[PDB]
Amino acid sequence: HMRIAQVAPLWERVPPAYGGVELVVSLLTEELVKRGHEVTLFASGDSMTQAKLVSTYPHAIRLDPNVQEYAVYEALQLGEVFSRANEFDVIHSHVGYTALPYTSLVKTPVVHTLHGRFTADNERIFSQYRNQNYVSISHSQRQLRELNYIATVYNAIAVETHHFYPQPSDPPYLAFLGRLSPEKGPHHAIEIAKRVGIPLRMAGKVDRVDRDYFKELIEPHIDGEFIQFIGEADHPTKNALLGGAIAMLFPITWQEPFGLVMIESMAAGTPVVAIAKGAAPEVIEHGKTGFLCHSVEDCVAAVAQVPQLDRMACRDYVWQRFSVERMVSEYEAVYDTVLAN
Amino acid sequence: HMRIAQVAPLWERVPPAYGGVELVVSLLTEELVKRGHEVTLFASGDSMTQAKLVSTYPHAIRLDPNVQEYAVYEALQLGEVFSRANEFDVIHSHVGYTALPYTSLVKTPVVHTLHGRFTADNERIFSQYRNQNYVSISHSQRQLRELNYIATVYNAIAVETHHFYPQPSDPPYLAFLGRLSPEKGPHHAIEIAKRVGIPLRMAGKVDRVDRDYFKELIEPHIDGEFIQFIGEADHPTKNALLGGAIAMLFPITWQEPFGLVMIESMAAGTPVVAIAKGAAPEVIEHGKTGFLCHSVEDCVAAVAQVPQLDRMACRDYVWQRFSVERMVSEYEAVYDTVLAN
Ligand SMILES: O=c1ccn([C@@H]2O[C@H](COP(=O)(O)OP(=O)(O)O)[C@@H](O)[C@H]2O)c(=O)[nH]1
Ligand SMILES: O=c1ccn([C@@H]2O[C@H](COP(=O)(O)OP(=O)(O)O)[C@@H](O)[C@H]2O)c(=O)[nH]1
């Protein structure tokens, strides 16, 4: 019954392979349409949606090599969004802090879903716009506390679009799936697999800022066989990568906002061995769907106990707690509260 | 008799050493205050101004190591400027395309000085906002054609604050002054000085991105005595550098928007050997204040015929075309035209 704008990042298509945010914007957008709202989606032109697509460039920016200046396109899109404020009852921003100053200039209310970590720089602008409507994606993300949080709304995935692997592959292997940043601890993953004796199949994006970290600290240990790299996985690849593993290693070293790869692994039937930072304690059910750990050697021990976990319970777990219909109903509750203020 | 906002980039102080845009904004601002206008400067908090300073962070960002997210402070500053839009008769913006969509959300008219080069990427946003008030800083910069160009206002310097050097230093040397980027061609400047056999005395800034370029193509040549660097120079230093040389080399491989170092050299008495790209043909009068060349070896030959040029005429020329009085009077004409529409 409402007019809703969905403002998606433009890096990835609303996504073929890497890209958490645009995946969540997609599932939210399509479900809001099925529920009878009038939705406009602001994303790349290749985006697939039953909503009205407003696009400022025909291709997602990252995997296009003819485009580089991201900020040009963020400004175009912010332009197309807020020059149309009166066409919507609620504006759902997923693009982060650049949307904050526009919001004080139109009268249509705006919901900001926090998709990244709070930093020493970005706390400065968030604190300045502390009264705008925020949704966190985990309780641990909220490191400000000073902001007007409307709710925590946990992320979700389309569980049914992940094949379920009742039993891991043979020959046995461990999976790493994520961007090759020090924040995701893939250096720790090679450690863990070498220590415990089970090969590792890694996968993920390597982008500039991290190219030094890769070339120096990952590249020399991939030598095929025990450490295989694969290199950035699309949906069917990563489903088979995770489902086939006995455990997905998640040795993060940073205040992880949510960690969608954890719920994607459990949906395939594969529990997660994670370092207990950021949102991992909220997502993993220690002893049931994986193990919360505080060191590499905690992780190595957890891998030795994973065979005793029920793989089918890991999938059930994501249906209960991280399903799409829950997330969209919680966002619909946020829109109601915002609109009634 | 006008309330005028000046919105400066935040990378440099409105500038101790490197910084072209922020120097020009400074000169425009201070003079607009003397002519009686009521000016607000939006710049870093260490900026020195007789206008009202509204700052979003106490120090310039490039040489601050506790700041790593320029967009945060940019988005903050655009917020401060346009939320106060009706405190001003006109907003003079120097921060590029990120102000274009804001301009559609306020009634107060905006003037954009274009300080950079058109790219395949930024033409997409300027084209979307072609009816806005643009000032180009050279004629060769105007590569779009479809835009509402109010005027060309060439940049200026405070000629009097530059010591004039009637004779170059003996033994001779050549000068380079600029950021150590491929666009500025300091690799060419080294080549030219080696073929010519006069020593090079360089100076400038290495932002990262140019870091591998400096290490591979510049660093190996500066080790010796014949090339000298003393990196990143303040005003007394750069003046003495330029004034001492027989000629400043300006071997650009870019569509240079303007090129302040050329008028800074000419003011000290030093003519310019320049590659005839971007704004170079408009700023240099070939055969009088320098030479326009098409190649490296062109510059080698032209260095030989530099002593025939009249050093006082180089300073006369900057007073005649690139003085501050000219530039501010021309900018007031632009405010007048914008308000009358
Ligand atoms: O090679 C890869 C690496 C990652 N992803 C996906 O991109 C998202 C990563 O988001 P996540 O929440 O795990 O962490 P983030 O990178 O956003 O901090 C997940 O859907 C991954 O399945 C992918 O498709 N291919
Ligand atoms: O070590 C340096 C290098 C450059 N500059 C100044 O930085 C400005 C650069 O402006 P220009 O148009 O020449 O180059 P760009 O703005 O395109 O970087 C000029 O005032 C230079 O005098 C400086 O003070 N010190």
TrEMBL record, chains A, B:
Q: Does the keyword Metal-binding apply?
A: no
Ranges of residues in domain Glycosyltransferase subfamily 4-like N-terminal: 19-120
Gene3D superfamilies according to UniProt:
Glycogen Phosphorylase B
Answer yes or no on keyword DNA damage. Answer: no
A molecular function annotated in GO for this UniProt entry is: nucleotide binding
Q: What are the residue boundaries of the Glycosyl transferase family domain, all occurrences included?
A: 166-305
Name the domain of life this protein comes from.
Bacteria
Cite the binding residues for UDP.
18-19, 179, 184, 233, 238, 260-261, 264
Q: Which CDD domains has this protein been placed in?
A: GT4_AviGT4-like (cd03802)
Q: What's in the keyword line of the UniProt record?
A: Nucleotide-binding, Transferase
| InterPro entries (alphabetical) | Glyco_trans_1 (IPR001296), Glyco_trans_4-like_N (IPR028098), Glycosyltransferase_grp1 (IPR050194)
Q: What is this protein called?
A: Glycosyl transferase
State the species of origin: Thermosynechococcus vestitus (strain NIES-2133 / IAM M-273 / BP-1)
Classification lineage: Bacteria, Bacillati, Cyanobacteriota, Cyanophyceae, Acaryochloridales
